[PDB]
């Protein structure tokens, strides 16, 4: 799975995440995906580790919006608009090839 | 939402659909994505409608996978691995500009 600027591989965090397949400035879009958006209690056990919640709404995040992985000290952050429709992903420092894009926690 | 092939938007048949930006030849590979698999019984109401499912597990394509519509004249087809963790979209006749891309039930 990949696109002309990220691909998705093993990560040594565990499972899979998204590795740059060029060089990146800071705050430049990495990714812009659509998300499904449903009441929190909608929600099961299967995808916890990868929705993104706001107040009694939970989203699951499509295209590689949701293979980013998060760490203490990432390279980029996430965006959501206001009914978590949308989510977008930038960098917030420089990345270079073959290096993994993570978000906060 | 979109890459050099297709654009996610407003679909006749309700909510978004995925739409050609690109003709498609026969058998082309539109799409693959990976998906995430869990057992049946962790998932909740939210995303029934888009999930696929073998046995006792089901999985949730990621990338545009689950965007596409069904339709009971389709122009495509998706195709699962084994144990579901990869979904490609193939279409099963050409696809012109504008056309919506849309999978069997
Ligand atoms: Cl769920």
Do not use: Q
Request: proline share 3%; glycine share 8%; aromatic share 10%.
């Amino acid at each position: 799975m990949f696109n002309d600027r990220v691909i998705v591989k093993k990560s040594p965090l565990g499972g899979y995440g998204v590795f740059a397949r060029k060089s990146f400035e800071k705050g430049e879009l990495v990714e812009e995906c659509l998300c499904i958006v449903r009441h929190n209690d909608d929600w099961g056990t299967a995808l916890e580790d990868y929705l993104f919640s706001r107040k009694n709404m939970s989203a699951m995040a499509l295209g590689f919006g949701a293979i980013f992985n998060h760490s203490k000290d990432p390279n980029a952050r996430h965006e959501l608009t206001a009914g978590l429709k949308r989510m977008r992903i930038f960098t917030i420092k420089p990345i270079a090839i073959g290096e993994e894009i993570t978000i906060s926690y």
